[PDB]
Amino acid sequence: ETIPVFDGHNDFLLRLLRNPANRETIWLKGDGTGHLDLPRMKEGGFAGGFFAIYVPSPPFELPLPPMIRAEQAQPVALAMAGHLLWMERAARGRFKVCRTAAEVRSCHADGIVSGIMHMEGAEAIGADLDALHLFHSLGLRSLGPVWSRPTVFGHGVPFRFPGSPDTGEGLTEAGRRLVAECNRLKIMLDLSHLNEKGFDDVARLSDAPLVATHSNAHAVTPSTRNLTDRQLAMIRESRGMVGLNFATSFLREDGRRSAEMGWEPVLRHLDHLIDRLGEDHVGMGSDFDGATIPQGIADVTGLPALQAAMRAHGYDEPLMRKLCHENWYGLLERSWGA
Amino acid sequence: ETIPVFDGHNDFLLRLLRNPANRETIWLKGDGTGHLDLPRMKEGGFAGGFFAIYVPSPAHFEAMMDAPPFELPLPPMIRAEQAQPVALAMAGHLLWMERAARGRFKVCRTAAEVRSCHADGIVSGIMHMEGAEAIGADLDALHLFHSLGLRSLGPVWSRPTVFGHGVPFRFPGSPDTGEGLTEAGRRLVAECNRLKIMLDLSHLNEKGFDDVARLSDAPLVATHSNAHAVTPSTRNLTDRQLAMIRESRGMVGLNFATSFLREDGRRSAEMGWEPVLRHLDHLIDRLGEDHVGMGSDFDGATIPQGIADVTGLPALQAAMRAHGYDEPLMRKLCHENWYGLLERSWGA
Ligand SMILES: [Mg+2]
Ligand SMILES: [Mg+2]
Ligand SMILES: [Mg+2]
Ligand SMILES: [Mg+2]
């Protein structure tokens, strides 16, 4: 009675980027490192998720990395998109890249692992947006305009604790064009990493539900990466969605990276998000393979232990199902049509 | 009396790559230069064609082809890391052309789509890659480009790749200029067959051609190449290569480049119709009436003064008719032979 989980964000693709020669083993067998691979997804009741294409750069605060332009980002983003299509070839029907809400739901029914092509940081898209149309043809259905790094579209938050997400300038003209064009193409915009001014611009300009695929409650942990109550109110009004990030740095009240922590911070964030957003607007946004996560979860096979903790906390079965997958599926329908 | 033409190869996207700030005018209005633009296409009876994504290398070359014997050196190899941004730029302009034209141009992914454009008078475009530099030896990007609409690929231009080797521009000379396909090239042929991406042998050298003839399960195609027996350019096809194409039920598109039409292999646009008609006769004779069409190389070559740009297609058709091609043969040469080839390569 593990409930299948659909997840808001993972960086498994980055592992294939860094060791392409070993891709067969890492994806199909596992290489005994990291949080994810196909057998462990199955063992832990991972139903699918958004798979990020993320172009990497070469009290605390990390400096912002330099901007990467489309010429340098494009080959890396193509490499990662190429690995995601390869995963589907190699898994011979047990994994499917989905481009519609109906496809996600059919995978769920069929026990086929679903994947949504997601871009975290829009460096591979030029200010002209021509590449946005190309990526959309390839299957891209979700885009975070920024990572924690300046782009031609706007600005992401630096990693800092404690601090407000109001960390810099809002969207550029090109970023405002990017919102309008993702709305028209029905590409879900992802606000995670975006700074508060950029968030405000999206809230003002987008005609679609506001989404943060992997961010927690700033009221609970004041990381610059978490969402204030004001931002949560805006997400709620838009009938949007927030995916809970399993990064220890965004869960612990002290904002420390340490994995030595119990279920209380996880439940504290989940309670706060559910309380403010509503039961229909919260899900999982693990950041599997992109963060250090609680020792209690450890990797994707830790999802059943997380559910057991949520159950013990008193979340009823209908709410467990919404939190594990149903809320994401309804969000996809509200964002893309269904 | 102009028959709509479906064409084997043009390099219009290169004009857009070179001047992307002016693309709205270049495409929708014309900028008074070049061979193609949307109004002139309509004027000339251009039904559609393959639009090449071609990654250029870095006046001298044009001067060397003005007076043969000549041989241009091969440029250096370009790797996927460098080629990919350029091929994405061009692929991106092609999708833009369709957005901008608001229904008067359509990028087609199936033979049925191409035919439906023809019936509706909508200009059709097939996404074509000329030289496979933007594809790594691993082929992962082949799958990516196919998803976005790529349906045709020449593994090489006239430049070495990880897949094999193109011919140097030379006159006179054999197309047997270098080595055949690499192991990666053999895998590339197998995967284009599985994905049903049409292979284009134009620019490929003789050993590479032979490899594809042996390995491909699909009709052999050269989108823009003429008869070596008439003009012995390294870029043209020998009678042996023509017989191989004929046997596979393939296709050859006539290149309008003066260099590949004139008996003397010169670049000058100052020429009549007789060489055009000589090549067409020879092709038709050896390939059959079903296996020949146009492959202009519009915006990619110097072409005869009598054609000059896409508005000259009607003049070419009049010369063909005056040469005694009847109407059913005209319709085969102008478009029906390509549509048939697409059905044999991709499925009907
Ligand atoms: Mg990530
Ligand atoms: Mg992230
Ligand atoms: Mg060309
Ligand atoms: Mg060419």
XYZ file of C-alpha atoms and ligand atoms in Angstrom:
690
model
C 0.000 0.000 0.000
C 2.758 2.340 -1.076
C 0.925 4.928 -3.084
C 2.626 5.666 -6.470
C 4.352 9.051 -6.283
C 4.579 11.539 -9.101
C 7.387 13.947 -8.455
C 7.979 17.597 -9.315
C 11.790 17.635 -10.014
C 14.836 15.440 -10.330
C 18.323 15.832 -11.820
C 18.957 12.272 -12.804
C 19.826 13.538 -16.272
C 22.896 15.257 -14.852
C 24.283 11.848 -13.883
C 24.054 10.674 -17.495
C 25.614 13.935 -18.660
C 28.621 13.305 -16.383
C 29.124 9.662 -17.285
C 27.551 8.927 -20.677
C 29.736 5.872 -21.347
C 28.086 4.100 -18.406
C 24.485 5.240 -19.133
C 23.163 1.620 -19.669
C 24.259 0.521 -16.214
C 23.350 3.751 -14.395
C 19.762 3.851 -15.794
C 18.827 0.168 -16.171
C 20.777 -1.441 -13.292
C 21.901 1.358 -10.975
C 25.551 2.009 -10.246
C 24.972 1.979 -6.499
C 25.380 5.753 -6.140
C 22.834 8.623 -6.151
C 19.100 8.606 -5.555
C 17.510 7.208 -8.725
C 17.627 4.547 -11.393
C 14.897 2.403 -13.000
C 14.969 -0.602 -10.574
C 14.967 1.710 -7.515
C 12.069 3.798 -8.932
C 10.062 0.546 -9.163
C 11.080 -0.614 -5.705
C 10.123 2.742 -4.134
C 6.768 3.399 -5.918
C 8.078 6.294 -8.098
C 5.287 6.668 -10.752
C 7.103 9.373 -12.751
C 8.162 12.947 -12.558
C 9.592 15.973 -14.210
C 13.154 15.216 -15.456
C 15.170 18.483 -15.516
C 17.483 19.530 -18.249
C 19.825 21.716 -16.239
C 23.042 23.257 -17.647
C 25.630 23.237 -14.857
C 28.140 25.991 -14.084
C 31.944 25.336 -13.657
C 24.780 31.931 8.148
C 25.933 31.546 4.520
C 25.691 32.929 0.996
C 27.033 31.459 -2.261
C 27.950 33.940 -4.997
C 25.906 33.875 -8.257
C 27.753 32.090 -11.080
C 28.354 33.904 -14.381
C 25.640 33.846 -17.102
C 25.898 31.104 -19.750
C 24.678 32.148 -23.210
C 22.651 30.007 -25.709
C 25.723 29.139 -27.835
C 27.411 27.401 -24.885
C 24.235 26.071 -23.239
C 22.587 24.568 -26.300
C 24.947 21.597 -26.816
C 24.662 20.691 -23.105
C 20.849 20.955 -23.129
C 20.747 18.844 -26.330
C 23.001 16.283 -24.745
C 20.632 15.971 -21.783
C 17.475 15.949 -23.910
C 19.187 13.223 -25.975
C 19.821 11.115 -22.831
C 16.163 11.446 -21.790
C 14.966 10.086 -25.229
C 17.600 7.357 -24.913
C 16.165 6.333 -21.469
C 12.841 5.735 -23.170
C 14.407 3.665 -26.017
C 16.481 1.679 -23.570
C 13.644 0.952 -21.143
C 11.681 -0.784 -23.930
C 8.208 0.487 -22.819
C 8.756 0.670 -19.003
C 9.439 4.429 -19.156
C 7.583 6.978 -21.335
C 8.272 10.665 -22.049
C 4.793 12.205 -21.848
C 3.629 15.337 -23.662
C 0.020 15.403 -22.424
C -1.907 15.064 -19.176
C -3.823 12.088 -20.649
C -0.490 10.291 -21.370
C 0.672 10.832 -17.773
C -2.615 9.402 -16.500
C -2.463 6.365 -18.792
C 1.122 5.627 -17.610
C -0.118 5.774 -14.049
C -2.929 3.333 -14.800
C -0.523 1.027 -16.664
C 2.346 1.138 -14.132
C 4.641 2.727 -16.760
C 7.114 5.283 -15.339
C 6.365 8.671 -16.786
C 8.756 11.498 -17.486
C 8.104 15.106 -18.346
C 10.850 16.961 -20.200
C 11.636 20.003 -18.061
C 14.236 22.745 -18.453
C 15.650 24.331 -15.287
C 17.076 27.668 -16.392
C 16.339 28.796 -19.941
C 19.981 29.473 -21.024
C 19.526 27.201 -24.059
C 16.779 29.513 -25.330
C 17.931 32.724 -27.046
C 16.252 36.090 -26.301
C 14.539 35.649 -29.720
C 12.732 32.538 -28.392
C 13.235 30.501 -31.662
C 14.672 27.635 -29.576
C 11.608 27.577 -27.267
C 9.535 26.401 -30.322
C 12.199 23.786 -31.170
C 12.355 22.412 -27.635
C 8.577 22.337 -27.550
C 8.591 20.151 -30.671
C 11.068 17.800 -28.954
C 8.644 17.365 -26.050
C 9.569 20.141 -23.575
C 6.478 20.901 -21.431
C 7.854 22.703 -18.410
C 10.410 25.529 -18.138
C 11.958 27.415 -15.177
C 13.204 30.618 -16.752
C 16.118 30.824 -14.283
C 18.277 28.622 -12.113
C 20.263 30.350 -9.299
C 22.214 32.347 -11.976
C 21.391 35.452 -14.190
C 19.905 34.751 -17.693
C 18.679 37.012 -20.549
C 15.122 36.509 -19.115
C 15.656 37.500 -15.475
C 17.332 36.651 -12.217
C 17.478 33.711 -9.859
C 18.052 33.834 -6.100
C 21.537 33.162 -4.744
C 21.655 30.340 -2.201
C 21.620 32.118 1.167
C 20.349 31.518 4.683
C 18.680 33.366 6.275
C 17.318 35.798 3.695
C 14.345 37.081 1.699
C 13.730 35.810 -1.882
C 13.767 39.541 -2.866
C 17.337 39.311 -3.997
C 17.515 41.209 -7.334
C 15.843 42.536 -10.485
C 12.653 41.209 -12.101
C 12.079 39.838 -15.620
C 13.712 41.538 -18.627
C 11.654 42.422 -21.709
C 12.743 39.064 -23.185
C 11.557 37.319 -19.978
C 8.129 38.954 -20.326
C 8.031 37.646 -23.926
C 9.027 34.226 -22.633
C 6.059 34.152 -20.230
C 3.619 35.120 -23.005
C 5.051 32.532 -25.406
C 5.034 29.692 -22.803
C 1.376 30.599 -22.070
C 0.532 30.360 -25.816
C 2.387 27.070 -26.268
C 1.004 25.655 -22.964
C 4.493 25.175 -21.504
C 4.171 25.213 -17.683
C 6.369 27.854 -16.103
C 8.327 26.837 -13.021
C 9.024 29.647 -10.471
C 11.512 27.653 -8.310
C 14.849 29.573 -8.179
C 13.185 32.701 -9.555
C 13.651 35.776 -7.268
C 10.712 37.594 -5.715
C 10.539 40.449 -8.305
C 10.576 37.919 -11.208
C 7.946 35.907 -9.363
C 5.774 39.064 -9.085
C 6.192 39.657 -12.837
C 5.094 36.120 -13.641
C 2.128 36.398 -11.227
C 1.099 39.564 -13.014
C 1.641 38.328 -16.620
C 0.922 34.634 -16.795
C -2.556 33.388 -17.625
C -1.799 29.919 -16.216
C -1.593 28.415 -12.659
C 1.572 29.529 -10.794
C 3.841 26.658 -10.087
C 7.051 26.123 -8.003
C 8.129 22.538 -8.625
C 10.640 22.311 -5.812
C 10.391 24.971 -3.073
C 9.285 24.968 0.595
C 7.826 27.359 3.165
C 9.922 30.451 3.951
C 7.819 30.960 7.110
C 9.238 27.595 8.294
C 12.846 27.858 6.909
C 13.883 31.351 5.749
C 16.056 30.178 2.818
C 16.128 32.520 -0.190
C 14.921 29.410 -2.133
C 11.608 29.074 -0.142
C 8.237 30.809 -0.677
C 6.838 33.529 1.548
C 3.193 33.432 2.671
C 2.466 36.268 0.267
C 3.848 34.184 -2.609
C 1.857 31.171 -1.387
C -1.331 33.329 -1.415
C -0.662 34.247 -5.089
C -0.053 30.609 -5.994
C -3.328 29.684 -4.216
C -5.350 32.324 -6.055
C -3.986 31.058 -9.399
C -4.991 27.431 -8.549
C -1.313 26.516 -8.732
C 0.964 23.934 -7.145
C 4.051 23.643 -4.916
C 6.257 20.579 -4.816
C 8.020 19.890 -1.506
C 11.844 19.923 -1.913
C 13.620 17.250 0.071
C 16.853 19.336 0.315
C 17.819 19.330 4.028
C 18.892 22.993 3.594
C 15.327 23.965 2.676
C 13.563 21.816 5.313
C 15.514 22.220 8.589
C 14.613 25.202 10.721
C 18.333 25.997 10.960
C 18.893 25.766 7.208
C 21.881 23.428 7.630
C 22.861 20.913 4.939
C 23.077 17.986 7.378
C 21.091 14.814 6.606
C 20.868 13.973 10.295
C 17.292 14.972 10.825
C 13.954 13.329 11.585
C 10.530 13.605 9.943
C 9.442 16.724 11.929
C 10.780 19.366 9.508
C 9.256 17.553 6.493
C 5.863 17.451 8.246
C 6.243 21.059 9.408
C 6.682 22.294 5.833
C 3.943 19.992 4.508
C 1.520 21.208 7.218
C 2.324 24.892 6.451
C 1.920 24.479 2.673
C -1.281 22.453 3.012
C -2.650 25.007 5.506
C -1.994 27.980 3.249
C -2.339 26.584 -0.290
C -5.120 24.075 0.295
C -5.071 20.267 0.132
C -5.283 20.408 -3.680
C -2.185 22.508 -4.246
C 0.693 20.635 -2.718
C 2.794 17.699 -3.850
C 6.319 16.271 -3.908
C 9.205 18.093 -5.613
C 12.079 15.912 -4.391
C 15.174 17.406 -6.043
C 16.343 13.725 -6.140
C 19.965 13.686 -7.458
C 20.113 17.487 -7.097
C 20.396 17.905 -3.246
C 21.402 16.253 0.027
C 18.173 14.810 1.488
C 17.041 13.490 4.898
C 18.668 10.281 6.142
C 15.133 8.927 6.593
C 14.465 9.125 2.841
C 18.083 8.508 1.600
C 17.066 7.840 -2.044
C 13.929 7.015 -4.052
C 13.456 3.693 -2.185
C 12.815 5.872 0.905
C 9.388 7.052 -0.456
C 7.482 4.381 1.407
C 9.045 5.448 4.753
C 8.084 9.032 3.973
C 4.501 7.964 3.354
C 4.489 6.005 6.596
C 5.606 9.164 8.403
C 2.858 11.242 6.687
C 0.253 8.594 7.628
C 1.467 8.519 11.269
C 1.174 12.316 11.254
C -2.576 11.798 10.581
C -2.972 12.589 6.906
C -6.007 10.628 5.705
C -5.913 8.367 2.605
C -7.608 10.817 0.199
C -5.128 13.506 1.196
C -2.202 10.986 0.874
C -3.300 10.243 -2.695
C -3.534 13.975 -3.571
C -0.137 14.653 -2.049
C 1.523 11.621 -3.747
C 0.222 12.117 -7.322
C -3.325 13.403 -7.836
C -2.499 17.066 -7.218
C 0.204 17.072 -9.924
C -2.100 15.342 -12.427
C -4.821 17.938 -11.859
C -2.221 20.752 -12.125
C -1.022 19.299 -15.496
C -4.652 19.386 -16.715
C -5.038 23.029 -15.600
C -1.724 24.050 -17.256
C -1.805 22.086 -20.512
C -5.560 21.248 -20.949
C -7.477 17.989 -20.291
C 0.532 26.109 -68.018
C 3.297 26.296 -65.344
C 3.220 22.985 -63.395
C 3.895 23.397 -59.586
C 7.469 22.323 -58.797
C 8.604 20.388 -55.761
C 12.314 20.796 -55.436
C 15.082 18.664 -54.038
C 17.360 21.153 -52.298
C 17.635 24.781 -51.440
C 19.756 26.834 -49.080
C 17.317 29.640 -48.290
C 17.868 29.064 -44.518
C 21.495 30.168 -44.963
C 20.244 33.629 -45.980
C 18.295 33.741 -42.778
C 21.308 32.577 -40.753
C 23.463 35.328 -42.283
C 20.936 38.120 -41.630
C 18.484 37.094 -38.946
C 17.461 40.686 -38.045
C 15.958 41.183 -41.494
C 14.249 37.753 -41.763
C 10.684 39.105 -41.798
C 11.403 41.094 -44.980
C 13.677 38.496 -46.484
C 11.030 35.779 -46.216
C 7.624 37.518 -46.480
C 8.672 40.341 -48.845
C 11.981 39.432 -50.470
C 14.997 41.734 -50.140
C 15.760 41.969 -53.863
C 18.646 39.469 -53.658
C 19.006 35.694 -53.924
C 16.880 33.043 -55.540
C 13.922 32.483 -53.173
C 11.358 34.226 -50.983
C 7.636 33.599 -50.350
C 6.215 36.023 -53.056
C 8.628 34.808 -55.751
C 7.866 31.168 -54.843
C 4.183 31.834 -55.614
C 5.145 33.747 -58.777
C 7.452 30.954 -60.058
C 5.096 28.035 -59.189
C 7.361 26.702 -56.404
C 5.143 24.109 -54.615
C 7.731 23.382 -51.933
C 10.977 21.540 -51.341
C 13.645 20.316 -49.012
C 15.030 23.219 -46.942
C 18.624 22.413 -46.027
C 20.114 22.973 -42.629
C 23.690 23.324 -43.698
C 26.506 24.383 -41.305
C 28.928 26.603 -43.204
C 32.754 26.479 -43.074
C 34.883 29.704 -42.649
C 35.591 35.014 -53.008
C 38.620 32.727 -53.466
C 36.531 29.536 -54.055
C 34.265 31.266 -56.606
C 37.403 32.487 -58.468
C 38.935 28.954 -58.657
C 35.766 27.510 -60.264
C 35.730 30.265 -62.952
C 38.536 28.563 -64.939
C 38.990 24.700 -64.757
C 40.848 22.298 -64.242
C 40.352 23.174 -60.568
C 40.258 21.603 -57.131
C 39.214 23.238 -53.924
C 40.838 21.856 -50.733
C 38.503 20.195 -48.241
C 37.701 22.407 -45.231
C 38.450 21.094 -41.741
C 35.984 18.924 -39.796
C 33.420 20.705 -37.572
C 32.404 18.723 -34.425
C 28.872 18.536 -32.950
C 29.691 21.041 -30.115
C 30.342 23.747 -32.753
C 27.771 22.585 -35.320
C 24.796 22.190 -32.986
C 24.094 25.914 -32.191
C 24.223 26.675 -35.953
C 21.924 23.763 -36.918
C 19.503 24.771 -34.172
C 19.543 28.369 -35.395
C 18.593 27.191 -38.915
C 16.015 24.683 -37.690
C 14.635 27.551 -35.615
C 14.347 29.864 -38.678
C 12.514 27.134 -40.553
C 9.814 26.862 -37.787
C 9.663 30.614 -37.736
C 8.980 30.717 -41.501
C 5.889 28.636 -40.856
C 4.690 30.799 -37.927
C 5.331 33.971 -39.945
C 3.582 32.845 -43.102
C 0.333 32.195 -41.234
C -0.752 29.104 -43.119
C 0.873 29.743 -46.548
C 3.884 27.579 -45.718
C 3.901 24.305 -43.841
C 6.763 22.196 -42.545
C 5.697 18.601 -43.506
C 6.614 15.398 -41.764
C 4.710 12.934 -43.896
C 4.106 12.210 -47.527
C 0.338 12.704 -47.006
C 1.045 16.169 -45.594
C 3.138 17.127 -48.615
C 0.398 15.967 -50.930
C -2.278 17.809 -48.994
C -0.189 21.040 -49.299
C 0.108 20.497 -53.037
C -3.673 20.130 -53.381
C -4.304 23.225 -51.187
C -1.604 25.440 -52.800
C 0.216 25.715 -49.500
C 4.035 25.794 -49.963
C 5.530 22.683 -48.307
C 8.935 22.486 -46.597
C 10.828 19.290 -45.624
C 13.451 19.727 -42.905
C 16.729 18.519 -44.416
C 20.242 18.398 -42.921
C 23.148 18.747 -45.378
C 26.132 17.206 -43.639
C 25.595 15.503 -40.327
C 28.038 17.525 -38.148
C 25.300 18.447 -35.633
C 24.907 14.704 -34.924
C 27.392 13.040 -32.572
C 28.818 9.606 -33.362
C 26.557 8.284 -30.581
C 23.446 9.318 -32.753
C 21.560 10.659 -29.752
C 20.889 13.960 -31.583
C 19.588 12.061 -34.674
C 16.597 11.097 -32.503
C 16.245 14.664 -31.265
C 16.266 16.222 -34.743
C 13.761 13.585 -35.948
C 11.384 14.546 -33.117
C 11.493 18.096 -34.190
C 10.766 17.245 -37.841
C 14.005 16.211 -39.631
C 13.074 13.772 -42.434
C 16.115 13.875 -44.698
C 19.877 13.833 -44.018
C 23.052 13.871 -46.125
C 25.705 12.342 -43.964
C 28.339 14.655 -45.488
C 28.780 17.915 -47.242
C 32.057 18.392 -49.191
C 34.036 18.215 -45.855
C 35.136 15.227 -43.605
C 32.730 14.150 -40.764
C 32.733 11.383 -38.064
C 30.520 9.386 -40.435
C 32.542 9.513 -43.674
C 33.852 11.730 -46.418
C 32.511 14.160 -48.985
C 33.978 14.861 -52.437
C 36.193 17.950 -52.974
C 34.868 20.408 -55.592
C 36.982 19.325 -58.573
C 36.754 19.411 -62.359
C 37.359 17.117 -64.172
C 37.540 14.130 -61.821
C 36.058 10.914 -60.477
C 33.682 10.947 -57.434
C 36.080 8.273 -56.055
C 37.983 10.774 -53.947
C 38.481 9.281 -50.506
C 37.532 6.718 -47.897
C 34.088 5.201 -47.290
C 31.826 5.351 -44.260
C 33.240 5.038 -40.777
C 31.804 2.591 -38.278
C 29.712 5.569 -37.044
C 28.555 6.161 -40.625
C 27.398 2.580 -40.905
C 25.411 2.966 -37.689
C 23.995 6.240 -39.007
C 22.664 4.505 -42.154
C 21.072 1.731 -40.032
C 19.374 4.281 -37.718
C 18.105 6.531 -40.579
C 16.539 3.359 -42.053
C 14.853 2.502 -38.688
C 13.586 6.121 -38.155
C 12.653 6.418 -41.824
C 14.821 9.490 -42.388
C 15.751 9.641 -46.115
C 19.470 9.484 -46.796
C 20.838 12.009 -49.310
C 23.984 10.897 -51.214
C 24.748 14.264 -52.854
C 28.303 15.363 -51.832
C 29.087 11.861 -50.600
C 32.174 10.281 -52.354
C 32.087 7.072 -54.345
C 33.257 4.649 -51.564
C 30.660 6.150 -49.144
C 27.945 5.854 -51.841
C 28.877 2.186 -52.350
C 28.597 1.597 -48.546
C 25.132 3.109 -48.467
C 24.071 1.149 -51.575
C 25.168 -2.037 -49.724
C 23.789 -1.186 -46.314
C 20.594 0.884 -46.816
C 17.262 -0.903 -47.043
C 15.655 2.244 -48.602
C 15.656 3.872 -52.130
C 18.931 5.609 -52.940
C 18.612 9.323 -53.340
C 20.820 12.198 -54.483
C 18.816 15.385 -54.044
C 21.061 17.611 -56.079
C 23.494 15.951 -58.494
C 23.789 15.575 -62.247
C 25.264 13.151 -64.824
C 29.017 12.585 -64.649
C 28.890 11.151 -68.187
C 27.809 14.644 -69.393
C 29.837 16.868 -66.919
C 32.683 15.023 -65.151
C 32.476 17.049 -61.871
C 33.404 15.107 -58.737
C 29.893 16.178 -57.609
C 28.075 14.291 -60.386
C 26.903 10.651 -60.653
C 28.530 7.985 -62.845
C 26.428 5.586 -64.952
C 27.348 2.844 -62.462
C 25.970 5.004 -59.610
C 22.841 5.754 -61.698
C 22.221 1.996 -62.262
C 22.437 1.411 -58.473
C 19.925 4.241 -57.885
C 17.626 2.812 -60.561
C 17.718 -0.659 -59.009
C 16.822 0.644 -55.509
C 13.821 2.588 -57.021
C 15.489 5.871 -55.916
C 15.604 9.454 -57.179
C 17.960 12.105 -58.540
C 17.274 15.820 -58.462
C 18.831 17.982 -61.213
C 21.193 20.621 -59.721
C 20.951 24.029 -61.396
C 24.635 24.891 -60.554
C 26.317 25.988 -63.827
C 29.446 24.093 -62.684
C 27.578 20.776 -62.718
C 25.580 21.350 -65.932
C 28.031 22.809 -68.440
C 30.098 20.354 -70.415
C 33.154 22.546 -69.642
C 32.449 22.642 -65.876
C 32.793 26.438 -65.664
C 30.951 28.717 -63.207
C 29.581 31.255 -65.695
C 25.800 31.876 -65.701
C 26.192 32.788 -69.397
C 24.924 29.583 -70.953
C 21.846 28.323 -72.825
C 19.395 25.454 -72.135
C 21.196 22.678 -74.081
C 23.363 21.432 -71.099
C 20.287 21.361 -68.766
C 18.465 19.336 -71.402
C 21.471 17.099 -72.028
C 21.656 16.111 -68.322
C 17.912 15.626 -68.026
C 17.934 13.401 -71.134
C 20.788 11.318 -69.772
C 19.240 10.950 -66.299
C 15.819 10.094 -67.684
C 17.368 7.665 -70.101
C 19.351 5.705 -67.517
C 17.167 6.116 -64.370
C 13.755 5.986 -65.978
C 10.971 8.562 -66.194
C 9.924 7.830 -62.580
C 13.301 8.533 -60.927
C 14.232 12.068 -61.909
C 13.187 15.512 -60.644
C 14.533 18.954 -59.744
C 17.128 19.627 -57.047
C 17.862 23.245 -57.807
C 20.386 24.188 -55.151
C 18.573 27.588 -55.161
C 20.444 30.079 -52.921
C 23.292 27.560 -52.792
C 24.882 27.931 -56.288
C 25.307 30.044 -59.391
C 22.621 29.005 -61.844
C 21.921 29.605 -65.528
C 20.979 33.134 -66.651
C 17.796 31.674 -68.262
C 16.600 30.515 -64.829
C 18.157 33.280 -62.625
C 15.921 32.690 -59.563
C 12.738 30.802 -58.637
C 10.655 33.060 -60.938
C 12.553 31.347 -63.818
C 10.968 27.883 -63.286
C 8.341 28.653 -65.946
C 11.120 29.416 -68.480
C 12.763 26.101 -67.653
C 9.431 24.290 -68.139
C 8.956 25.993 -71.556
C 12.423 24.849 -72.627
C 11.575 21.280 -71.476
C 8.297 21.311 -73.374
C 9.940 22.801 -76.459
C 12.453 19.911 -76.155
C 9.486 17.516 -76.508
C 8.727 16.236 -72.986
C 5.007 15.479 -72.906
C 2.696 16.535 -70.081
C 2.567 13.381 -68.047
C 6.443 13.361 -68.050
C 6.465 17.099 -67.109
C 4.261 16.425 -64.109
C 6.544 13.511 -63.049
C 9.685 15.677 -63.411
C 8.118 18.765 -61.722
C 6.641 17.059 -58.608
C 5.069 13.586 -58.894
C 8.396 11.742 -58.879
C 9.426 13.355 -55.580
C 6.051 12.618 -53.999
C 6.340 9.012 -55.012
C 9.892 8.838 -53.678
C 8.711 10.260 -50.311
C 6.094 7.478 -50.102
C 8.759 4.824 -50.868
C 11.172 6.253 -48.283
C 8.848 7.192 -45.416
C 5.647 5.239 -46.126
C 2.374 6.255 -47.764
Mg 17.666 20.487 -10.697
Mg 16.848 23.335 -8.535
Mg 22.962 23.330 -49.676
Mg 24.972 21.044 -51.640
